[PDB]
Amino acid sequence: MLSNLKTGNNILGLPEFELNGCRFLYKKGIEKTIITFSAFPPKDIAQKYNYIKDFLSSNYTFLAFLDTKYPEDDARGTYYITNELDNGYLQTIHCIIQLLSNTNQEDTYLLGSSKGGVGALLLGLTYNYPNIIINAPQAKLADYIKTRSKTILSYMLGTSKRFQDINYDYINDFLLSKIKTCDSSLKWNIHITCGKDDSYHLNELEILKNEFNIKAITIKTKLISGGADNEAIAHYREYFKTIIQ
Amino acid sequence: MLSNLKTGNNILGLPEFELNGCRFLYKKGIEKTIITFSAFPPKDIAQKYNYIKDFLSSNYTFLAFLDTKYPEDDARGTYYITNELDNGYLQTIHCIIQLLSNTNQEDTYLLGSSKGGVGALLLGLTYNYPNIIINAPQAKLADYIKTRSKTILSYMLGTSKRFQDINYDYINDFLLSKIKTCDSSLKWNIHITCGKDDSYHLNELEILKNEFNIKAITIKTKLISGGADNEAIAHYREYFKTIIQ
Amino acid sequence: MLSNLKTGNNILGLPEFELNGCRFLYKKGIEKTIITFSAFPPKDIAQKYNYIKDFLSSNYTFLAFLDTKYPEDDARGTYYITNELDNGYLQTIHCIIQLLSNTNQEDTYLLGSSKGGVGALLLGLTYNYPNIIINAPQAKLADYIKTRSKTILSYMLGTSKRFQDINYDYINDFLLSKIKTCDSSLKWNIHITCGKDDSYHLNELEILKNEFNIKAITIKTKLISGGADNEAIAHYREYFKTIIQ
Amino acid sequence: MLSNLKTGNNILGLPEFELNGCRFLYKKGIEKTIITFSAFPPKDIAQKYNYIKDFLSSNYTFLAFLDTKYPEDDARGTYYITNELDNGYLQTIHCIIQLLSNTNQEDTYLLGSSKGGVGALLLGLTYNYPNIIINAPQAKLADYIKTRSKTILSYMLGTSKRFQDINYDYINDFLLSKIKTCDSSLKWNIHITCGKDDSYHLNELEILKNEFNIKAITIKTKLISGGADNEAIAHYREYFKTIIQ
Ligand SMILES: CC(C)(COP(=O)(O)OP(=O)(O)OC[C@H]1O[C@@H](n2cnc3c(N)ncnc32)[C@H](O)[C@@H]1OP(=O)(O)O)[C@@H](O)C(=O)NCCC(=O)NCCS
Ligand SMILES: CC(C)(COP(=O)(O)OP(=O)(O)OC[C@H]1O[C@@H](n2cnc3c(N)ncnc32)[C@H](O)[C@@H]1OP(=O)(O)O)[C@@H](O)C(=O)NCCC(=O)NCCS
Ligand SMILES: CC(C)(COP(=O)(O)OP(=O)(O)OC[C@H]1O[C@@H](n2cnc3c(N)ncnc32)[C@H](O)[C@@H]1OP(=O)(O)O)[C@@H](O)C(=O)NCCC(=O)NCCS
Ligand SMILES: CC(C)(COP(=O)(O)OP(=O)(O)OC[C@H]1O[C@@H](n2cnc3c(N)ncnc32)[C@H](O)[C@@H]1OP(=O)(O)O)[C@@H](O)C(=O)NCCC(=O)NCCS
């Protein structure tokens, strides 16, 4: 029963729930389902639901997801990939959306802005959610995680030295392969913004674009003012607010 | 959206849904949530939902689950274990129950005979459903599956010759492992019936009881009239109706 | 019929055949039978036959072999080991040589560098070809393959998580096992060159030499100028021409 | 070199060869290639090449194969199936035919009369030899082997009690699955005779026919006088002699 999954936290009035290690906010509305995924918090800051305020006044159904809860000594998330390095976490997010949302998948929109954009794509490309509107996702996931936390990377690489560099490359290409194995025949509505001064994520975007091209998937991109900063974030929020409206 | 998960099939008064390969019936009621698990169909018979008619006049919330849909050559189920021999399928069942049921965990009952009772044990012991009322579960799962379908056991075993033995003990002990790792502090309410003349499954029960015993889990067992037949099933049906009320 | 095995391709003066997935060149000559094994191609280059031009003016019988054609994603070969990690592919090579060559076993020479020398060792040690003249073979096969292509090693490793470690040591030690089980009574004529500055493969050679040593197999080793480069290859070519004549 | 594979035996003038454990006779002719497979000899009688005399006066290319050489304490053959229970022995037979025969596969004819007929089908259905003319093959291979030799059956079932009944059923259905996975689009020319008083093998024939029907393969059958005896054998030989001529 949904209310027995409550964790006791409340965020801007919204009660937090947890199911199979997957923490989420849920509010039942009408007409559209908005889904947001959490981005990478600063070191020692708890994971945040992002882009609640953008929909507080809305009448839409709203869900907001956090990342996994491990490694415990740097619990900032493993990029929506399980510690078994498979889809188990995405699978749970999918069940939650499919059973609580009151709209079909074409009236559902996935949002997220860094790690959160990667989460949005991983879910959308696995389970065919067509509308994905994200900012500056990472493409080489393990390369990036290495710059932010050895604790998380080493947790995900595993204890066996023989498989660490294998797991490294598997994590690194985890998103790219989701593109390589997605449906191609779906009418995707993927929008990816990125700050014009975000040199690092513009090169990540080129990498993602190539993989879509190989798969014959058209996406929309838009450079916005700013870099890897809140100027870009501010413009991302205005961008997705117009697309949904 | 639940409505969008409909398969189009309607078994007795109840619509069928599918989510992540998991086919299920569901009807909203009150007071209690009844869960049933499909048992192993005879050869060339499709997987059936079990113990629907028992609860059509109950007004309880009711869910009934089929087993996995692979291997397609003998699609009678893999004992609720995925092709990767993990919890992925049980995890989907859990989400469906947790989000659709409108009663507490202690007001929820897992029912099943034969393979269905294995599924009830696997779900209940993995995710702490305390009320489990089942008849003649197998204990050594691979030993039993091979006497019914070499195709299914071969499918679960995998392709590599030099891992067919390892995976065999892993499948064989998959239920026993769940007992070994379950939470001994839960106020377990496990009832297992078995036909008096069902010597095979009488011994499986002792195998199971030894694992419960050493985890300090006290269960209720009742010998009923019959063997591995529909006499025992009829007495099993009478037993779980009596306990539920 | 051999003529019916033609692929239609003709590399230099020699027609290509395929039998049971095994692509090979063959030209009938006299006095000696020369066998070469393809080495590991750089990324996105197709598998090439090696050391053809060395013998175009020789009038010797000549056969050149490619590696397996899988995985199709990175089809550069599986170190002459089948997808079932057994001798099936080496066994096909053996039949082709035994039935097409017109000279004794002692007048037959197995050539190859890098992965090609591994293939020469695997064939010669399995089926008693005494004359083996190779440069810088790997010893720990999986350790090396993972530094060139995660796809190929994953393909050889298989799908089950709980067998990726077992199969890794099995692949890694597949050549060393052939040494452990070869016939010590054969009048082995094994020559292994290695570049003086090829530290990685200098150590692989010591690993190999230790296995030969304890099987009482005396081999000839020669340090040549160069490292893991085309200098060493040129001196390797000069070495095997000198030995053959 | 073919002549170095000689075993030292000579049968009706024909020198015997051996390659990878596979013993064969070979004579090079023109126009057609005739292949025969050995049948199950009496206990303590060595395996025989069958139907040599039928082609001694012919000008055709001729090959005759025996079965595997294990188990050593009842070396009457394991039905052309390796002790690894795979295609390795058929693979060797195929290489030998493909590299020594001077005709294409449509001018090649596979003959055999009991176990030998099964060998003929196993090779023909695996490697697409269209012309297969056999008498009274077994369908349930392990059921039959059980009546002739516990030593051979136990050797093939393997030492692990857990896999003995799995290996039993795999061996039993080894032929049926060759039918289930064969090409269907090939223009098969399969002729199966059987003695009208061979009640046991007429029921084996019905089983084989069904599997062909499911696969949409037309075959030709012919009842001949005799039972499981030389009267039937005599008529089988006249039958295949007219079909080839
Ligand atoms: C840009 C950002 C700061 C905007 O914040 P915002 O304008 O307040 O809007 P949000 O809808 O995200 O609301 C967050 C609010 O809910 C709070 N909140 C969010 N998750 C919470 C949680 N698990 N527990 C308690 N409070 C939470 C936040 O602290 C904040 O409340 P506040 O008013 O006290 O600050 C935020 O959306 C964000 O950081 N996004 C990710 C940026 C990125 O992509 N990358 C940076 C790392 S490379
Ligand atoms: C007892 C049993 C045989 C039948 O009992 P029952 O009186 O029919 O009661 P149920 O509630 O189980 O009825 C199932 C109903 O749902 C129908 N149904 C179930 N699954 C269905 C499906 N995929 N599609 C269509 N109909 C389905 C059945 O056809 C049946 O309807 P009907 O008989 O009226 O036509 C059944 O419960 C069963 O198979 N139990 C298994 C016991 C066991 O241990 N089996 C393994 C032995 S080794
Ligand atoms: C030395 C080397 C680089 C080239 O030497 P070379 O002077 O060209 O002599 P080779 O006899 O090997 O020539 C091969 C010829 O056959 C051709 N050939 C080989 N395989 C072919 C194929 N499938 N299709 C078409 N052509 C093919 C080649 O194109 C080449 O012909 P070309 O150069 O005249 O056009 C080659 O032998 C080689 O790759 N060796 C591998 C050494 C090694 O260790 N590699 C792995 C390093 S980690
Ligand atoms: C029917 C059969 C006896 C006919 O024998 P045949 O008329 O002499 O014709 P073949 O072409 O088969 O020639 C066999 C000859 O070569 C000999 N020969 C065959 N294989 C031999 C071998 N490995 N080593 C030495 N001699 C061999 C045979 O002994 C015989 O020689 P012989 O004249 O001394 O008797 C024989 O073909 C046969 O037994 N076929 C199998 C019958 C069957 O299908 N099932 C019975 C078991 S259920």
Residue numbers in the entry:
A (entry chain B), B (entry chain A), C (entry chain A), D (entry chain B): 1 to 245
Reproduce text from the manuscript describing this model.
The key enzyme is the O-acetyltransferase CsaC (MynC) encoded in region A of the CPS gene cluster. Each protomer consists of a central eight-stranded β-sheet that is sandwiched by six α-helices and capped by a lid area formed by helices α5, α6, and α7. A deep positively charged groove, which traverses the protein surface, allows substrate binding and opens into an active site that is characterized by a catalytic triad composed of S114, H228 and D198.
As soaking of CsaC-WT crystals with acetyl-CoA or CoA yielded only incomplete substrate density and co-crystallization trials were unsuccessful, we soaked crystals of the catalytically impaired variant H228A with acetyl-CoA. All protomers showed complete density for CoA with a free SH-group. Concomitantly, the triad serine showed an extended electron density with a contour indicative of its O-acetylated form (AcS114). The pantetheine moiety is engaged in hydrophobic contacts (I233, A39, and F40), and only the distal carbonyl oxygen is specifically recognized by S113-Oγ, a contact that directs the SH-group towards the triad serine S114. The purine nucleobase of CoA is sandwiched between I11 and K48 and locked into position by a hydrogen bond between adenine-N7 and Y49-N, while the phosphate oxygens of the ADP-3′-phosphate moiety are encased by a hydrogen network provided by R237, K53, Y51 and I52. In the H228A(-AcS114)-CoA complex, Q138 positions AcS114, which is approached on the opposite side by the SH-group of CoA. In support of our hypothesis that Q138 can substitute H228 as a general base in the first half-reaction, Q138 is optimally positioned in both CsaC-WT and the CsaC-H228A(-AcS114)-CoA complex and impaired acetyl-adduct formation was seen upon simultaneous replacement of H228 and Q138.
